[PDB]
């Protein structure tokens, strides 16, 4: 097979709860087969921590939807795009509405992410187009807390579509609302101007077949 | 409790992933029956955030295992005690190793809470008594990330025992390690010298048959 079979080292990834649970596992699987002798470590944190770990060299790759593509000291690459969905009890009024609207949604107590995490600004901007503030009864740092309080009757949720919405957890159900909110990007961030072991560049290629190692590198070293 | 049918206001509780998921829901159900007209809001955050929100009055009650009982500006009451347990795949060597010792566990990749959160220091200290550092292969902000990576194969997990609760892990098993680590405590904190609405005082009581309302007030106020 491959030439990367005795490649060794330690790849440290810093990431959020969202990608840790809903996107990375697949990629990690692929990477462990490809690089069996490379130790992989993860640190979970907020976007702001992820950016600091990057600028200190405490992590090799940072993965999040916020603050990586706007840091002078990093360089970030698109991984995939995603949208929020509505998470509601299986028989909630909103399930007998249609077309779903922002007006519609703004009527219910809302359970979603704190500011500056998992696309929260997209939710806010969506309502702002209609002059509205959302009724936020729970500010979560993760989709799992959201599911708990939707199940518990406290309000409806806005979550990342990939948080599976919640397909398994029965009595809950995801309603697609692509038409109401703008898209998000998950970013792959590296420290600007910093050389990296081979398995680091290879790792970006595994998340996004659309990236080329040459172009990524040429672009980290621009400065 | 028809005395309190028309009690109204906003109760803001600040808390961690752990209690938001595994202990509060029950209490919150109780509270919503008792106080149907009071609006309940939750903020999820790190223990240090929680302390700040209390200092600022941005939250009425703070609930966490760390940093509340040692802040000069807060007053904290014990809610209950809890221990870590060991989360491993169904067919893992550790399920075949018997008596489970620190030294044994120390051999494997650990997936556990980051320092400062969900009793991590009970873990570090336990190991330090044996001259050991744990191999942290993933440092987590919450127990669901830990579940995902243990399931994936990355390593074994040290998790709060209470996170087993619901939809309990398919092909994972919890091994009892109370004899190996010390207990943790979950605190209920209020701002010291702060006056409150009647329902805040009740929430605390509702949480703990131990404390009475008068003793809570007396002790928050005494300084």
Curated annotation (Swiss-Prot), chains A, B:
What are the disulfide bonds?
none
- Record-stated family: Belongs to the LysR transcriptional regulatory family.
GO BP term, pick one: regulation of DNA-templated transcription
Superkingdom of the organism of origin: Bacteria
**GO terms for MF:** DNA-binding transcription factor activity; transcription cis-regulatory region binding
Keyword Coiled coil in record: no
Q: Tell whether Heme is among the UniProt keywords.
A: no
Supply the alphabetized keyword list. Answer: DNA-binding, Transcription, Transcription regulation
Q: What is the protein named?
A: HTH-type transcriptional regulator cbl
Q: What does this protein do?
A: May be an accessory regulatory protein within the cys regulon.
């Amino acid at each position: 097979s491959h030439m990367t079979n005795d490649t060794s080292g330690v790849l440290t990834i810093a990431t959020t709860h969202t990608q840790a649970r809903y996107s990375l596992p697949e990629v990690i699987k692929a990477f462990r087969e490809l690089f069996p002798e490379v130790r992989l470590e993860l640190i979970q944190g907020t976007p702001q921590e992820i950016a600091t770990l990057l600028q200190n060299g405490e992590a090799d790759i940072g993965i999040a939807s916020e603050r990586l593509s706007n840091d002078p000291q990093l360089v970030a690459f698109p991984w995939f795009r995603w949208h929020h969905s509505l998470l509601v009890p299986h028989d909630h009024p909103l399930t007998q509405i249609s077309p779903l609207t922002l007006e519609s949604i703004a009527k219910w107590p809302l359970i979603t992410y704190r500011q500056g995490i998992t696309g929260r600004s997209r939710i806010d901007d969506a309502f702002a187009r209609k002059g509205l503030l959302a009724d936020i009864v729970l500010s979560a740092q993760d989709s799992d807390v959201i599911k708990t309080y939707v199940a518990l009757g406290l309000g409806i949720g806005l979550v990342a579509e990939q948080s599976s919405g919640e397909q398994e957890e029965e009595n809950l159900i995801r309603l697609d609302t692509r038409h109401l909110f703008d898209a998000n990007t998950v970013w792959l961030g590296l420290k600007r101007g910093q050389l990296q072991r081979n398995y680091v560049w290879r790792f970006l290629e595994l998340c996004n077949a659309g990236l080329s190692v040459e172009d990524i590198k040429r672009q980290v070293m621009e400065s």
